[PDB]
Amino acid sequence: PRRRVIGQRKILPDPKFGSELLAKFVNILMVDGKKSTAESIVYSALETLAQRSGKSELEAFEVALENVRPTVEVKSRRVGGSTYQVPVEVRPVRRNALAMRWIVEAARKRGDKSMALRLANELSDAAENKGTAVKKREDVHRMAEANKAFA
Amino acid sequence: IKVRENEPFDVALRRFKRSCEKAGVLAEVRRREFYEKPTTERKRAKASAVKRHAKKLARENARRT
Amino acid sequence: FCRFTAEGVQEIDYKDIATLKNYITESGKIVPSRITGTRAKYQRQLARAIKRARYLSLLPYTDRH
Amino acid sequence: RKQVSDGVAHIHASFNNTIVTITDRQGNALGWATAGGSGFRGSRKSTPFAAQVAAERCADAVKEYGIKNLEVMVKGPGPGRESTIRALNAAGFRITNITDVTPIPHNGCRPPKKRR
RNA sequence: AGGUAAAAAUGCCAAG
RNA sequence: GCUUGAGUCUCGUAGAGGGGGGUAGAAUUCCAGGUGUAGCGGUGAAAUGCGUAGAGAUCUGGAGGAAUACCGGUGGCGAAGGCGGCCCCCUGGACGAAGACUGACGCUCAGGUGCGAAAGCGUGGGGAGCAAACAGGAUUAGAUACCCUGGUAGUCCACGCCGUAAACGAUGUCGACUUGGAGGUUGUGCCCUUGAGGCGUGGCUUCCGGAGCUAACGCGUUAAGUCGACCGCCUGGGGAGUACGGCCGCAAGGUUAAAACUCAAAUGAAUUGACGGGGGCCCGCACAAGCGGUGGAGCAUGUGGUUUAAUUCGAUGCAACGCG
């Protein structure tokens, strides 16, 4: 705000398989604090995909992650006379922030029959750059090109 | 005004414009005669010249810098 | 801030066009004595000699014709 | 059609107006379009982003002439001055240069007194 | 050190 | 009579000082046409208007009036008003260096006289742009205004007239005398011009401050300090710089200039508090960035508005409306 820049906490490694990045998927999927249900659905997803694709477990969050890789977006500099968009350099935390956010926009919509149903598919869908997740970054890109070659 | 920095500018790099008289000067002789607001304005303009001049040399106390 | 003529005593001609061009910017505009920090009496010899050059088109009034 | 392969985008980007004029080096008009033509009723046609897109609707109609390169001349401070060139640096044109041909007078065309 | 920038729709009036 | 006052000459000095005559370039306005064409132009939002009878825009050529970007600088010159594109002809003043000469030839000044911003007036031209008047369109409770668009005299040149302005560093003219600093601007003398300088001196000159002065603010070797000479002038505000009379003017008016009557104040300086459709910086989920509701719908319920013989009433920007 106008004062001290706050920081972070001690985010717990996953008590199934120690890992922090995916722990925010819980956070970026949590609704009304239903952890066990998330523990039910979030878990259901990865192991079946690990089982379905054939690779390791913690390289499944990665396989999808390749083609959903974002780098930038817009953060407009509307000084008060120029609301022209200005693209932003999406920093790591800022990067992974919208990252686990793209798993949201993709999965929450077009509810087939179950969360783990779509989530697992979207992962490997994201792994071949032909699904919702991967383009979720692409769409962002085409509203940034608007302005090029600035100083 | 005339910028064509051989080949590799490829961007604005139009300081040649902004440094001399870019439209701000057009936006200086815009629309009004007065004859005199500037007559008065130059006097007040220069007024700042000496006082701000003092600010650099009248800042010479301790002030715990 | 060239200590030009406070120690360079002579009359400023327009014929020395090489020396003359050193006082006009690329956009034609003649540059003030403030930046060059030389004497106005001496700088006075400049502007009139400029128009002499300007009148003969030896230099430009303003390049965009 | 004569199919000329070079041209010039004059731009009349005034305080509250912006018109783009892509002609050749002989003054014959090749292709013209404006932010005004984009509709953008009154106030709203004064935005830099507006002129950028209008240039997108202006980068055409010269491709039909075999246009290759071009130089930009803009006038009027207002918005723009770069908005269009940004949309022109990438409009699909090997741009040579950009110049400001603004009419600097020498004190004597009496200017209006409005706006009190 | 240091110099441009910036909006200007409209709204009046009082006995202890 | 003399000369320390004052006045002129010899040699240089920078400057928009002034009168007049030619001339350059940018820019706008307009004409002619080419290309090309649905807009141009406007702003608080427009609308008026200009437009397919083909403008805007853009380009070549041409027709014009008018002022001079940059330089440019509490930079310079002038009695003030004031004056700068360039070029030339006529021509004023002010300052410096060492002597020459004259030998108080001074200062101020009723009346008189000359100059004297703009607007304005007369006569003949000119008439880009701008623009009183003006009309159309907006705004407004009204808006014979502020704003948009056209648009007239004027603005501009010549020859006369008007003689007033916040013609104001709001400070008369002239001379002497009484701490310094920062400079600036413009000539000059001495020294190693060893270098854009060091050490003095002439003028104009901007700011800061000593004593002093002042009611204070502030001024302060550029005095509002310390004296002297001379002159214009003041006597509460209003009435009134108005009337009448004189003079001056084509007119506008200008100038010299009351009284009756009315009030117990009008007035300057300063700083507290207040206000600001004034700001400089900081601060709160004030917003950003995000999480997730309300605004759709049903129903609970309040309030308003309605309706009712009666449907108690208070609370109603923020700080009332699932409140009493």
Largest CA distance in chain A: 56
| C-beta atoms of C63 and B16 within 8 A | no
Q: Which residues of A touch B11 (CB under 8 A)?
A: 149, 151
Between CA B39 and CA A45 the distance in angstroms is: 78
DSSP H or E run through D29 = strand D29-34
First-to-last alpha carbon distance for chain A, in angstroms, is 28
Q: Nearest chain A residue to D87 by CA: give it.
A: A147
Residue for token pair 């004059």: D10
Residue for token pair 């020498």: D106
Could you tell me if A27 and A12 are in contact, meaning their C-beta atoms sit under 8 angstroms apart?
no
Q: At what angle do helices A92-108 and A115-126 cross, to 10 degrees?
A: 130
CA angle A18, A21, A26 (to 5 degrees): 90
Q: How far is the CA of B46 from the C1' of F227 (A)?
A: 39
| C-beta atoms of A83 and D52 within 8 A | no
D115: Cβ–Cβ under 8 A, 6 or more apart, which residues? B31
Q: What is the DSSP letter of A68?
A: G
Q: Nearest chain C residue to B22 by CA: give it.
A: C27
Q: Which residues of B touch A151 (CB under 8 A)?
A: 11-12
CA angle B6, C17, C35 (to 5 degrees): 75
In A13-30, which positions are buried (b, 16+ CB within 10 angstroms) versus exposed (e)? ebeeeeeeebbbbeebbe
Q: Do the two chains D and B touch, given a threshold of 8 Å on CB pairs and at least 3 pairs?
A: yes
If you count DSSP H runs as helices and E runs as strands, how many of each does chain A have, helices first? 6, 2
Which tokens in the block code for residue D29? 């008009």
Which tokens in the block code for residue A121? 């598919």
Q: Residue A46: which region, alpha, beta or left (left: phi > 0; alpha: psi -120 to 50)?
A: alpha
Q: How was this structure determined?
A: cryo-EM
First-to-last alpha carbon distance for chain D, in angstroms, is 51
| C-beta atoms of D47 and A83 within 8 A | yes
- Give residue ranges of D with CB < 8 Å to any B CB: 76-77, 81-82, 85, 89, 96-100, 102, 104-105, 107, 110-115
| C-beta atoms of B14 and D98 within 8 A | yes
